[PDB]
C-alpha cells in the first residue's frame, strides 16, 4: 500500500538510542537491507557507526560488501564505486586487495 519508509528509519535510530549489543546492529542492518529502498549515505554512515560502536571490523566488511552487492537496481556501479570510495576514505578499511586476488 506504498506505506511510509522513513518510519522504519526512525525506528532504526530509536533502537540505536536503545542499542545494547551487536545483535541490534545485525537486526537493523537486516531490516534495512531487506527493504526495496536504497540507503542514502547518511543512513549508511549511521549503520556503519552503529556497527563500529562495538568496533568489529568484520561487521565493516559485511556492510561494505553488502553495499557493493545489495540490490541489482539495473546494475548500478559508478554510484556504488564513489559511495564505497568515500565511506572507505572516511575511516579506512582496506580489504578488497585480499579477497579479490583469489
Amino acid at each position: 500500500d506504498e506505506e511510509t519508509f522513513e518510519e522504519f528509519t526512525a525506528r532504526y535510530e530509536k533502537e540505536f538510542d536503545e542499542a545494547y549489543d551487536l545483535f541490534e546492529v545485525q537486526r537493523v542492518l537486516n531490516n534495512c537491507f531487506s527493504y526495496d529502498l536504497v540507503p542514502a549515505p547518511a543512513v549508511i554512515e549511521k549503520a556503519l557507526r552503529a556497527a563500529r560502536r562495538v568496533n568489529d571490523l568484520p561487521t565493516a566488511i559485511r556492510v561494505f560488501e553488502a553495499l557493493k552487492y545489495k540490490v541489482e537496481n539495473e546494475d548500478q556501479y559508478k554510484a556504488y564505486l564513489d559511495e564505497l570510495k568515500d565511506v572507505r576514505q572516511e575511516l579506512g578499511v582496506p580489504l578488497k586487495e585480499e579477497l579479490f586476488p583469489s
Binding site: 537486516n30 537491507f33 559485511r62 553488502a66
Partner: protein, 534 residues
C-alpha cells in the same frame, strides 16, 4: 504400558499411528498396482490366466484402498491433531474417546474389506458403484455389504474427526488471536472439515440406501421397477468432487506453510486468498456436476454447469501466481521441500491445464470417457496426494522426531519418483489422442511400447518405495550419527548475507509458530499456559 498405543488420550500417538496405517496401506496398494501394471505390461495371459473378474477385483481394490486408506487418514489426521490445537495455545484436545472409537471401528472396515476382496465372487465394479453395474447378480456374495459397512465406518470416523477439529477451532481459540488473520493452514483445515461435514452425510445416506436395496430387495435404483440410479450417481459426484477438494486443500495449506516458513517472506495476497479459499468452500456445492454432460441433461443445464466449472477455476491460477510471488524476491535453498513443492506446483499446473481442456462441454462429447479424462485425474490426484504427503514427511520428520534425515537419500528418492512419474505420464497425451480403451485386461497390442515404459516407471516407483522403507530404517538406526555429522541437513533455512554466525545460531528460526523450536514432543500435558500474541 499398552494404554498409550490403545487408549491414546494424546493426539500425537494417534497421529503417528494413523501415519503408520496409511503408509502400510499405501505400500500394499503400490505393490498390487505394480502387479496390475505387470498384468497390463503385455497383452494376453503371462502371469494371470485372464480372469477379467479377478482383474476388475484388483482394479477396484487398487482404487478403493488408495483412496480410502492412504490419502485420507494420515494426511488430515496427523497434521490437524498435531498443529491445529497446538499452535492456537490449547493445552490438550478434547474427545479422546471419539478418536479411539474411530480407530477401533476401523479394523472392522479393514477385515470386512479384506474378506470382500478375498471371496470367489467379490465386488469389482470399480470406484463407481452405480447399479445395476454394482448389482448382486454379477458380484454376488457378501462383498457389497462389507464394502458398504467399511464406507459407513470410515465416513463416521472422518466426520467425527472433522467435528472435533471444528469445535477445537471454534472454542479453544486463544484470547490474543484475531479470526481474520488466521494462518492458511487453519483456514484450509476449516474449509476441508466443513466441506467434509456437508459432503460425507450425503454419500453415507446413499450408501445406506444401496445397502437397504441389497438386503431387503426393494426397488429404488434398479432399472426394473421404475428406479433412477442417476440419483445415486449425482450423490456420488457431489461426494467425490468435494472429496477431491478435501484431499487437495490441506495439501495447499501444507505447501503454503512450507513456503512461508522457508522463503522467509510473506505470501502474496495472504488475507485476500484466505477470503478466496472461503469463497471456494462456499461455492464448491455448485461445480460438482461437470462430469454428467452426457447423461441427457438439457442444453441450458449444460451451459450453466460449464459456466460454473470455468468461472470457479480462476483461484487455482491465483494460488499458482501467489506462490510464484512468494518464492519471488526471496531466498530459495536447494532443499528437498523446495524441489518437492516446485515439482508439485509444476505438475499441478499441467493437471489444471488438462482440466481446463476438459472444461468445455462441446469437446467432451468426443473427449469424455476417452483416455484423456482418466489421464487427467490420475495426474491431479497422483501428484497432489503423493507429493503433498512426501513433502509433509520430509518437512515434518525432524519436527516430530528430532532425528535428522539424510539429504542424499532424500534427493535420490525425489529423483526416482520424479523420473518415474514423468516417464509414466508423458506418453499419456499420445495415448489419449489415439484412444486407448480403458479397463481392458487384454488391450490391443498397439500400445505395447507405452505399456512397457509405464511398467518401467511403476517398477521405478516400487524400488523407490523400497528406498523409502530403507531410508526409514537408516533414520531409525543412525539418527544419532546424522545429528553428529553433516550427512543430514541440520537447519531448515540457510542464513542470509546480513547475519553473523553467533546471531544466526541464537536466531536459527524466525517463524510464525513455536512448533519449530518446541522441544521433541513432550508428555501428554503440554502447553500448560495459554499462548499470548500481539
Amino acid at each position: 504400558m499398552v494404554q498409550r498405543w490403545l487408549y491414546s488420550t494424546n493426539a500425537k500417538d494417534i497421529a503417528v499411528l494413523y501415519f503408520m496405517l496409511a503408509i502400510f496401506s499405501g505400500m500394499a496398494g503400490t505393490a498390487m498396482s505394480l502387479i496390475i501394471r505387470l498384468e497390463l505390461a503385455a497383452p494376453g495371459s503371462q502371469y494371470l490366466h485372464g480372469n477379467s473378474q479377478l482383474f476388475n477385483v484388483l482394479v477396484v481394490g487398487h482404487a478403493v484402498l488408495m483412496i480410502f486408506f492412504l490419502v485420507m487418514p494420515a494426511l488430515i489426521g496427523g497434521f490437524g491433531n498435531y498443529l491445529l490445537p497446538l499452535m492456537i495455545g490449547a493445552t490438550d484436545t478434547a474427545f479422546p474417546r471419539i478418536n479411539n472409537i474411530a480407530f477401533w471401528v476401523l479394523p472392522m472396515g479393514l477385515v470386512c474389506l479384506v474378506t470382500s476382496t478375498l471371496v470367489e465372487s467379490g465386488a469389482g465394479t470399480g470406484w463407481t458403484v452405480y447399479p445395476p453395474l454394482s448389482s448382486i447378480q454379477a458380484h454376488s456374495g457378501p462383498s457389497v455389504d462389507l464394502a458398504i459397512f467399511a464406507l459407513h465406518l470410515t465416513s463416521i470416523s472422518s466426520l467425527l474427526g472433522a467435528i472435533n477439529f471444528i469445535v477445537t477451532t471454534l472454542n479453544m481459540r486463544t484470547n490474543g488471536m484475531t479470526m481474520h488473520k488466521l494462518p492458511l493452514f487453519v483456514w484450509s483445515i476449516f474449509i476441508t472439515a466443513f466441506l467434509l461435514l456437508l459432503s460425507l452425510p450425503v454419500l453415507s445416506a446413499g450408501i445406506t440406501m444401496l445397502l437397504l436395496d441389497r438386503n431387503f430387495n426393494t426397488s429404488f435404483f434398479e432399472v426394473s421397477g421404475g428406479g433412477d440410479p442417476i440419483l445415486y450417481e449425482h450423490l456420488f459426484w457431489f461426494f467425490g468432487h468435494p472429496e477431491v477438494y478435501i484431499l487437495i486443500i490441506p495439501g495447499f495449506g501444507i505447501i503454503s506453510h512450507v513456503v512461508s516458513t522457508y522463503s522467509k517472506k510473506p505470501v502474496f495476497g495472504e488475507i485476500s486468498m484466505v477470503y478466496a479459499m472461503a469463497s471456494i468452500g462456499l461455492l464448491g456445492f455448485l461445480v460438482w456436476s461437470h462430469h454428467m454432460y452426457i447423461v441427457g441433461l438439457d442444453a441450458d443445464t449444460r451451459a450453466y454447469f460449464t459456466s460454473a466449472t470455468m468461472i470457479i477455476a480462476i483461484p487455482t491460477g491465483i494460488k499458482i501466481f501467489s506462490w510464484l510471488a512468494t518464492i519471488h524476491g526471496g531466498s530459495i535453498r536447494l532443499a528437498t521441500p523446495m524441489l518437492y513443492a516446485i515439482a508439485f506446483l509444476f505438475l499441478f499446473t499441467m493437471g489444471g491445464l488438462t482440466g481446463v481442456a476438459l472444461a468445455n462441454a462441446s469437446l467432451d462429447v468426443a473427449f469424455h470417457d476417452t483416455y484423456y479424462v482418466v489421464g487427467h485425474f490420475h495426474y491431479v490426484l497422483s501428484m497432489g496426494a503423493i507429493f503433498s504427503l512426501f513433502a509433509g514427511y520430509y518437512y515434518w520428520s525432524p519436527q516430530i522426531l528430532g532425528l535428522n534425515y539424510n539429504e542424499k537419500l532424500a534427493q535420490i528418492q525425489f529423483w526416482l519418483i520424479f523420473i518415474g512419474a514423468n516417464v509414466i505420464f508423458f506418453p499419456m497425451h499420445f495415448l489419449g489422442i489415439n484412444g486407448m480403451p480403458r479397463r481392458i485386461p487384454d488391450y490391443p497390442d498397439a500400445f505395447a511400447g507405452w505399456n512397457y515404459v509405464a511398467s518401467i516407471g511403476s517398477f521405478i516407483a516400487t524400488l523407490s518405495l523400497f528406498l523409502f522403507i530403507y531410508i526409514l530404517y537408516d533414520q531409525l538406526v543412525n539418527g544419532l550419527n546424522n545429528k553428529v555429522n553433516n550427512k543430514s541437513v541440520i537447519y531448515n533455512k540457510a542464513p542470509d548475507f546480513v547475519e553473523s554466525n553467533t546471531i544466526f545460531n541464537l536466531n536459527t528460526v524466525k517463524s510464525s509458530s513455536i512448533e519449530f523450536l518446541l522441544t521433541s514432543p513432550p508428555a501428554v500435558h503440554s502447553f500448560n499456559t495459554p499462548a499470548v500474541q500481539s
